[PDB]
Design brief:
Order of helices and strands of chain A: HH
Oligomer: part of a larger assembly
Number of helices of chain A: 2
PDB class: transferase
Structural class of chain A: mainly alpha
Keywords: transferase, mycolic acid biosynthesis, multifunctional enzyme, substrate channeling
Shape of chain A: elongated
Family (chains A, B, C): Belongs to the enoyl-CoA hydratase/isomerase family.
Largest sheet of chain A: none
Protein name (chains A, B, C): Fatty acid synthase
Entry title: Cryo-EM Structure of the Mycobacterial Fatty Acid Synthase
Chain lengths: ~45, ~45, ~45, ~50
Amino acid sequence: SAALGEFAEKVTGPDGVLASAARLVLNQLGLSDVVTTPEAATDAEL
Amino acid sequence: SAALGEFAEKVTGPDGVLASAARLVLNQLGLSDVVTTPEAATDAEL
Amino acid sequence: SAALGEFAEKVTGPDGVLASAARLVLNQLGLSDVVTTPEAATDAEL
Amino acid sequence: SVFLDKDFTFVVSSEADARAFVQFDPEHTVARPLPDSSDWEVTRKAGT
């Protein structure tokens, strides 16, 4: 239907360029842990 | 003191490569607004 | 009319890659000042 | 009032307005005729 198929592949490439470069600068992705919300949820529960 | 001076410049470059590539994938940086904490702070105040 | 729209975006990217790389090699763009032509114009006026 | 730390990106301006730009900065600003459109580009250097 859409000729855009190769423009989907052209998105993937820079993502790899982005991801690889991000690891060099030590920018941390997937840092979300159990810290704030549940404590607030505990406070909101009380 | 430290000969590392050009290794500081070599960090800056990929950062530009990172930043430019990040804008292409529409990954949004500086998204933090007033949403969660102050509401929790309001709840924690009560 | 023309499906080329994303091929216009694909031109912009390397331009940024070109511009950023050009600044590293200290290749100076926009160097044209008042030096030659007006002096010649002054000479051509006389 | 702030001093520009690094050169600003060029902007398009008229010849009359761009020559005026030069009258303030002139060591710190840069202006050129654009041969096709006859207008001028205004580029502020560092120190403006």
